[PDB]
Design a protein around this nucleic acid. Structure first.
Ligand SMILES: [Zn+2]
Ligand SMILES: [Zn+2]
Ligand SMILES: [Zn+2]
Ligand SMILES: [Zn+2]
Lengths: 109, 182, 66, 85, 160, 88, 319, 144
RNA sequence: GCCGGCUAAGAUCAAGUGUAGUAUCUGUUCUUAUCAGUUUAAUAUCUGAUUCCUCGAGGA
C-alpha cells in the first residue's frame, strides 16, 4: 500500500534531542511521542516535569529556558506569606511596621 | 521569517495552548491570544483528519434506543398524564463548552444484597454484631485515612446501628432560597 | 459582502478592530443612558461627548500597517 | 438563476397565485403567515402590476412572510420577488 | 502498584463499584479495576483497587484480609503435588506451615500468579520429601476444609 | 429540491458539401448516431443541414450520458474539421 | 479622587468606629493611566459627628472597593484582592489573591464567602480560609458582564446589573463544593444564569427590602434616568400562568407605539428568562373597551376581574 | 406548545446526531432549528446549548443539504440562545491557520453579525494595544 | 473487524449505468527513487533536470 506510506504521513521524519536524537516518523506518531514513556524519561533527565506546556518542544536549551520562564511566572503569582506580610512588632508597639514574618519571631523570641 | 514553536512559546502568556500549526498562521499572536480567552470552546478537532467525521470503528453496533424511565413508568387518561408529568425528570446535559467527537461515548455503609450474600445478619436492638473487618480495627486501632469515621462498639454506641448502616462519618447560615413558589 | 462590517478569510486584525470600534461609537451615540454614563464620568456636556465621538470616528486604532 | 430582487421595497403589496396561495416566499413554509410582503416599484409596474412573487402568474391573494421568518427579521431585506436572468 | 491493593476471591455478587464502596471505609479508593475474561466475559475473581496513599492500601490489606465477602474468601494484598482452588489469603510461608503437619517439605513452595495482576492465579505446586507425605496429602489434605475454600490435592505426574 | 440532457454539436459539417453529395448527409447522420449510441440511449437526434455552422442536437434520456458525449466530442476531429460540443 | 468608602470596627481595637476612604492619584481616563492610590483612615469620634485623621497608606493602584470582613477589611487594589488589619502607622497586609481577571469594581461578603465583581467579567466566588490564611477562587461565570452593581439575595444567589441596561440573577448549582485547595480557561466550577431582563436604562443600585408595613420583600432597583422599579417573585403557578397569558395576548393586540417588537426589546443583549413585563400588562387598563373585551374573553374573564387581579399584585408589594 | 417536551426528545436527537447516516443528521438539525425558534423567551437554554454541542461538529461537512440544515439550525440558535454564545463558538476559528476553517467560521460569523449587530458590542473580547495601534475601548472601563 | 500485523485506512485517470439530486461498478496505476520551483496549516499535486551482478536473457 505504498500509497498509504505517503498518504498517512510516512517518509517524513522528525527528531528530538530530548529523546536521544530518536528520529520519529509521520506527524501523527511524532505528536503523540511527547506523552509516551521515552519522552517522559528524557525530560526527567533535566528535572523538568512533562506537562502540556512542554509539547512540540524538541531541543534541550529551549526546554530549560521555558522552564525558567514558567518557574518565574508561577512563583511570582503565588501568595508567599513569609516575605509578603506586614507585621508591626510590640517592641515600640507604635512604630516599625516594616517587620517581615521572620523578624517578628526574632523580636518576640 | 516565521516563528518557531519554542520561540512563540516564549512570547505568549499561556504557552500550553500553542500547537504545531499555530506558527503557520497569518497572525499567530492574535490566534494564541484568542485561544486563551476565558471562554470560547475550541475547534472540532477533526478538521485535519481524513475520515469524514465518522469513525468506522469502536464497535458502534449497539442497542437502537433506550427510552427514559418516564416512558414506561383509551391508552392513558389524565391520570396517566398526571403520572407522566410527575415522573418527568431532567436528563443529563453537557455545559456550554463540551463538544462531541467520534470517540467520547465509550470512554461505613454497605448494600443489602452484599450483606445478604456475605452471610452477615441484620442489626439487633441492643447487642454487639460487628462486621468481620471491624475486629481488625478494634485490635490494631482506627484507620489513619479516615479518622472521622465512627463504628459501633469502638466509637459509636450500640443502641449507632439501624438497618444496613454500620458506620457514620462525623466531620468536625440562612440557607433557604429567596424567591420560590409555595 | 455588501454589508459593512462583515469579514472573510483574509481579514486582518486592524480591520476587525476598527470595525468594532466604529460600531461601538455609533452604539454610544444611539443609546441615551450610555452617553449619560460617559458624560457623568468625564464631567463634560453631552453635546461635547457626542462631538468627540464623531471626531474619533474618522481614524480609530491609529493609521494602518506599512 | 433563482435570485431575489433585494431592492428597496415600497408601498406595493406582494401577490400570490392560485397555486402558491398559502406559501411563504422565502422558506416555502405553509404554517402561520405573519407579515405582509412589500415589493419595489420596478416589480410593480405596467404588465408587472399583479403577479405572483414566487412564479409570476396572475395574482389572486396577498403574499405573507411566516412567523419563523419574521422572528429572524428576514422581512427586513429588499424586495423578495423571484427574478430570473 | 504500591498504592494499589490486589483483591482475590470475588464472587458474582461483587462488582466494580461494590469493591470501591466496601474499601471506602478503609481509605480513599480512587479507582477500581476488574479484568474481564475472554470466554465468559465476566470477572475471574481477582481485581485491583487503586487508592491515593500507600497507608490506606496497607490498612485495607490488614483489615480486609481473609474476609467472607459474597460467600467467597476475599483478601487484599500488595500488588510433585498440585493444589487447586486455594484461598489467596495464604502465603508461601503459610502454605509451608500448613503442609508441615502432614509431612516434611523439601523446599519453599511456589504459587502460580496471573500475568496481569500477579497476586493469585488459583493453583499452586508443592513438592514433598518422600511419597508417604504425598500419599498423606492425597488422603487427608485432598478435601480438607481450608479457609472458606475447598482445596483439591492431586499428583502432578504419575507413571502407570 | 435541487436544480429540478441535450448536447449541441457545432462545426461538424457544411451545407456546401451536401449540394453535390446527397449521400454524405445521411452517412454523417449515421456516423453521429453511432457516435452518440456509445455514450448512452439516444432518444432524439437531429442535424440542421441548412445551418452554416453545422448545428446538430442529440437528446438522450439521461443528462450524464449527454455530459459524457459532450466531454468526448469536444476537441475531436470529424471529417477534417474540429467540431465542438456544448450542453443545452 | 475618592472612589470607595467604608465604616467598620476592627477586632484588635475596642468598640471604636473607623472610616476608610480609597483615593486615586493622578488618574487619566483616556488613555487610562494612574500614578497610584491611598487609603485614608479616620476615627469618627464625638458620637459620629467628627472625623480625625489617623494615617494614610499608599497602594500601587486605585482602591475601588472596601468591605468590612470578620473584624478586618477587604480591599480591591486594581486587579488584586487583599485583606488588611488596622495598625498603628498604616494598614497591614495579611492575605492576597492574584488571579482575578481585569479589575475589581465591587466586593460583597456573606459570612463565609466573598463575591467579586470584575469590570468585564461578571462574578468570582472566593473563600477565605481562616486557619490557612488563604483566598481561593472556587467558582465563576460563563458570560462577560460589565457589572455596575451587585446585590446578595441569599447564600447562593447574586443579583447583578450592567452598563448596557440589563439585570441578571446568578445562582450556584447545588453540587458546588466550597472546600477547594479550569475547563474554559477559568475556574473548575461554573454558576448558572436563572434570570435575564433588559430594562432599557442603566441600573446603579439594587437592594432587597420591604417597602410597605406588613407587605412582602421585593428587589428595588434604580436607574440613571431617574426611574425607580421593583422585581417581585410569584408565589403560585396560577398567578404566573395568568400573567404569562396576559403578556402573550397583549404583545400581539397592543404592539409598541414606535414599531418595536416587545419580546425582542427585552431580549436586547440576552434572551429574556423568567420575567413578566408588568408595564406592558398594566396597559390593559388603557385600551379601548372593545379590545379589552377581546383580550379578557380569551382569559375566560371580564375586564374588571383582570383589573382587580393586576391591582392585587401591585398592592401586595408596592403602593 | 413545545416548551414542555424538549427534555423528552433530547436523547433521541443526540442519538440521531451521532449517526453516520446523512439524512439522520440533516433532519435532526431541522428539528433543532424548529424547536429553537418555537421556544424563545421561555427559558429552555440548557437543552439547546446541550444540543448545540452536538450540532456544531458538523460545520466541516461538504454535502450541501447537510450544511444548509446546519446553517438553519445555527441561525435558529442565534435567536433562542443568543449571539454571545455563537461568538464564543466562532472566536477560536476566526483566525485559524487553515483556509477551510477560516472560510467556514467567517461565513458563520457574518451570519451572526448581520443579525443583531448591536448586541455584539457588549460581547467582544478585550484585545491589548500593540506598539503601533490602540485597541482597548477605554470608555467601557470608566467606573462611576 | 481479529489475535504490531495480516495491503478492506487514502488519492487518482479512462470507460459503463442512472437520478431532479446524491451516486454505483470495472480496469487500472499508485510514485517503492533524488534535487529546484508552485502550492498546501503540513502532506499531496503539478511544473523541469538528473555501469554492476546473475544464468543472448533478467534484475539493479
Ligand atoms: Zn522527544
Ligand atoms: Zn418563511
Ligand atoms: Zn405562483
Ligand atoms: Zn424588486
Amino acid at each position: 500500500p505504498y500509497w498509504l506510506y505517503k498518504l498517512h504521513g510516512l517518509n517524513i521524519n522528525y527528531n528530538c534531542e530530548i529523546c536521544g536524537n530518536y528520529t520519529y516518523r509521520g506527524p501523527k506518531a511524532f505528536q503523540r511521542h511527547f506523552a509516551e514513556w521515552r519522552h517522559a524519561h528524557g525530560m526527567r533527565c533535566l528535572g523538568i516535569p512533562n506537562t502540556a506546556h512542554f509539547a512540540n518542544v524538541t531541543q534541550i536549551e529551549d526546554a530549560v529556558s521555558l522552564w525558567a520562564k514558567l518557574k518565574l511566572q508561577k512563583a511570582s503569582e503565588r501568595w508567599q506569606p513569609d516575605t509578603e506580610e506586614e507585621y508591626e512588632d510590640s517592641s515600640g508597639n507604635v512604630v516599625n511596621k516594616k517587620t517581615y514574618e521572620d523578624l517578628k519571631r526574632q523580636g518576640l523570641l | 521569517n516565521r516563528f518557531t514553536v519554542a520561540e512563540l512559546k516564549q512570547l505568549v502568556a499561556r504557552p500550553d495552548v500553542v500547537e504545531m500549526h499555530d506558527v503557520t498562521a497569518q497572525d499567530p499572536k492574535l490566534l494564541v491570544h484568542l485561544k486563551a480567552t476565558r471562554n470560547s470552546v475550541p475547534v472540532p478537532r477533526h478538521w485535519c483528519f481524513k475520515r469524514k467525521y465518522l469513525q468506522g470503528k469502536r464497535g458502534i453496533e449497539k442497542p437502537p434506543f433506550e427510552l427514559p424511565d418516564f416512558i414506561k413508568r383509551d391508552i392513558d387518561y389524565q391520570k396517566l398524564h398526571d403520572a407522566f408529568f410527575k415522573w418527568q425528570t431532567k436528563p443529563k446535559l453537557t455545559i456550554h463548552g463540551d463538544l462531541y467527537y467520534e470517540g467520547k461515548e465509550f470512554e461505613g455503609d454497605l448494600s443489602d444484597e452484599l450483606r445478604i450474600s456475605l452471610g452477615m445478619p441484620v442489626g439487633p436492638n441492643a447487642h454487639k454484631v460487628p462486621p468481620p473487618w471491624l475486629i481488625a480495627m478494634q485490635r490494631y486501632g482506627p484507620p489513619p485515612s479516615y479518622p472521622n469515621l465512627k463504628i459501633p462498639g469502638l466509637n459509636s454506641p450500640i443502641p449507632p446501628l439501624y438497618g444496613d448502616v454500620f458506620g457514620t462519618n462525623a466531620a468536625e447560615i440562612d440557607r433557604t432560597p429567596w424567591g420560590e413558589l409555595e | 459582502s455588501k454589508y459593512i462590517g462583515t469579514g472573510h478569510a483574509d481579514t486582518t486584525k486592524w480591520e476587525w478592530l476598527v470595525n468594532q470600534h466604529r460600531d461601538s461609537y455609533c452604539s454610544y451615540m444611539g443609546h441615551f443612558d450610555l452617553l449619560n454614563y460617559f458624560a457623568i464620568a468625564e464631567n463634560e456636556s453631552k453635546a461635547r461627548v457626542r462631538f468627540n465621538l464623531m471626531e474619533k470616528m474618522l481614524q480609530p486604532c491609529g493609521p494602518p500597517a506599512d | 438563476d433563482l435570485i431575489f430582487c433585494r431592492k428597496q421595497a415600497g408601498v406595493a403589496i406582494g401577490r400570490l397565485c392560485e397555486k402558491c396561495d398559502g406559501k411563504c416566499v422565502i422558506c416555502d413554509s405553509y404554517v402561520r403567515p405573519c407579515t405582509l410582503v412589500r415589493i419595489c416599484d420596478e416589480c410593480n409596474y405596467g404588465s408587472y402590476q399583479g403577479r405572483c412573487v414566487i412564479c409570476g402568474g396572475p395574482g389572486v391573494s396577498d403574499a405573507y412572510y411566516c412567523k419563523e421568518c419574521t422572528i429572524q427579521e428576514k422581512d427586513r431585506d429588499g424586495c423578495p420577488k423571484i427574478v430570473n436572468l | 502498584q504500591d498504592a494499589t491493593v490486589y483483591v482475590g476471591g470475588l464472587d458474582e455478587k461483587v462488582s466494580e463499584p461494590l469493591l470501591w464502596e466496601l474499601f471506602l471505609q478503609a481509605g480513599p479508593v480512587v479507582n477500581t479495576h476488574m479484568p474481564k475474561d475472554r470466554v465468559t466475559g465476566q470477572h475471574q475473581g481477582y481485581g485491583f483497587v487503586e487508592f491515593l496513599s500507600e497507608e490506606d492500601a496497607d490498612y485495607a490489606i490488614k483489615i480486609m484480609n481473609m474476609i467472607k465477602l459474597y460467600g467467597k474468601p476475599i483478601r487484599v494484598n500488595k500488588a510433585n503435588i498440585f493444589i487447586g482452588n486455594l484461598d489467596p489469603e495464604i502465603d508461601e510461608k503459610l502454605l509451608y506451615d500448613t503442609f508441615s503437619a502432614f509431612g516434611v517439605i523439601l523446599q519453599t513452595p511456589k504459587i502460580m500468579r496471573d500475568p496481569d495482576t500477579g497476586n493469585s492465579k488459583g493453583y499452586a505446586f508443592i513438592n514433598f520429601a518422600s511419597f508417604d507425605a504425598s500419599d498423606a496429602a492425597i488422603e487427608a489434605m485432598n478435601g480438607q476444609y481450608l479457609c472458606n475454600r475447598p482445596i483439591t490435592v492431586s499428583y502432578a505426574f504419575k507413571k502407570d | 429540491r435541487r436544480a429540478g440532457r441535450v448536447v449541441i454539436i457545432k462545426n461538424m459539417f457544411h451545407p456546401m458539401d451536401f449540394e453535390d453529395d446527397p449521400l454524405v448527409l445521411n452517412e454523417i447522420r449515421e456516423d453521429l448516431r453511432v457516435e452518440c449510441s456509445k455514450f448512452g440511449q439516444i432518444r432524439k437526434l437531429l442535424l440542421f443541414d441548412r445551418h452554416p455552422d453545422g448545428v446538430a442536437s442529440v437528446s438522450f434520456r439521461d443528462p450524464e450520458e449527454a455530459d459524457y458525449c459532450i466531454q468526448t466530442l469536444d476537441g475531436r476531429w470529424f471529417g477534417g474539421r474540429q467540431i465542438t460540443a456544448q450542453a443545452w | 479622587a475618592a472612589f470607595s468608602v467604608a465604616v467598620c470596627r476592627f477586632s484588635n481595637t475596642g468598640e471604636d468606629w473607623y472610616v476608610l476612604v480609597g483615593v486615586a492619584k493622578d488618574l487619566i481616563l483616556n488613555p487610562r493611566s494612574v500614578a497610584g492610590g491611598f487609603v485614608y483612615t479616620y476615627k469618627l469620634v464625638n458620637n459620629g459627628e467628627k472625623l480625625e485623621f489617623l494615617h494614610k497608606t499608599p497602594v500601587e493602584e486605585v482602591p475601588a472597593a472596601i468591605a468590612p470582613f470578620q473584624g478586618r477589611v477587604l480591599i480591591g487594589v486594581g486587579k488584586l484582592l487583599r485583606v488588611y488589619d488596622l495598625g498603628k502607622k498604616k494598614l497591614l497586609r495579611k492575605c492576597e489573591n492574584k488571579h482575578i481577571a481585569n479589575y475589581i469594581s465591587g466586593i460583597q461578603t456573606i459570612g463565609h464567602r466573598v463575591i467579586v465583581s470584575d469590570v468585564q467579567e461578571s462574578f468570582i466566588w472566593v473563600r477565605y480560609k481562616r486557619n490557612e490564611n488563604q483566598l481561593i477562587i472556587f467558582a465563576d461565570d460563563t458570560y462577560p458582564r460589565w457589572v455596575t452593581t451587585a446585590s446578595l439575595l441569599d447564600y447562593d444567589t447574586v443579583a447583578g446589573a450592567d452598563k448596557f441596561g440589563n439585570i441578571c440573577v446568578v445562582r450556584l448549582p447545588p453540587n458546588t463544593n466550597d472546600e477547594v485547595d479550569g475547563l474554559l480557561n477559568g475556574a473548575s466550577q461554573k454558576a448558572e444564569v436563572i434570570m435575564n431582563y433588559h430594562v432599557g436604562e442603566t441600573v446603579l443600585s439594587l437592594q432587597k427590602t420591604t417597602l410597605i408595613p406588613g407587605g412582602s420583600e421585593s428587589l428595588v432597583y434604580t436607574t440613571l434616568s431617574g426611574g425607580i422599579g421593583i422585581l417581585v417573585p410569584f408565589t403560585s403557578h396560577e398567578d404566573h400562568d395568568f400573567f404569562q397569558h396576559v403578556e402573550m395576548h397583549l404583545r400581539s393586540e397592543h404592539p409598541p407605539l414606535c414599531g418595536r417588537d416587545h419580546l425582542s426589546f427585552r431580549s436586547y443583549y440576552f434572551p429574556v428568562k423568567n420575567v413578566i413585563d408588568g408595564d406592558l400588562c398594566e396597559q390593559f387598563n388603557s385600551m379601548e373597551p372593545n379590545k379589552q373585551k377581546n383580550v379578557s374573553e380569551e382569559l375566560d374573564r371580564t375586564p374588571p376581574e383582570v383589573s382587580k387581579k393586576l391591582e392585587d399584585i401591585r398592592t401586595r408589594y408596592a403602593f | 406548545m413545545g416548551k414542555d417536551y424538549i427534555y423528552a426528545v433530547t436523547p433521541l436527537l443526540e442519538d440521531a446526531l451521532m449517526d453516520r447516516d446523512l439524512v439522520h443528521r440533516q433532519t435532526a438539525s431541522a428539528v433543532v432549528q424548529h424547536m429553537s425558534l418555537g421556544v424563545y423567551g421561555f427559558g429552555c437554554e440548557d437543552s439547546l446549548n446541550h444540543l448545540l454541542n452536538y450540532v456544531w461538529p458538523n460545520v466541516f461537512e461538504t454535502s450541501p443539504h447537510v450544511i444548509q440544515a446546519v446553517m438553519g439550525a445555527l441561525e435558529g440558535l442565534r435567536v433562542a440562545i443568543g449571539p454571545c454564545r455563537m461568538l464564543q463558538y466562532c472566536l477560536q476559528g476566526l483566525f485559524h491557520p487553515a483556509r477551510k476553517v477560516r472560510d467556514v467560521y467567517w461565513k458563520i460569523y457574518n451570519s451572526i453579525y448581520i443579525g443583531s449587530q448591536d448586541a455584539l458590542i457588549a460581547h467582544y473580547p478585550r484585545i491589548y494595544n500593540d506598539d503601533k495601534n490602540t485597541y482597548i475601548r477605554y470608555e467601557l472601563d470608566y467606573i462611576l
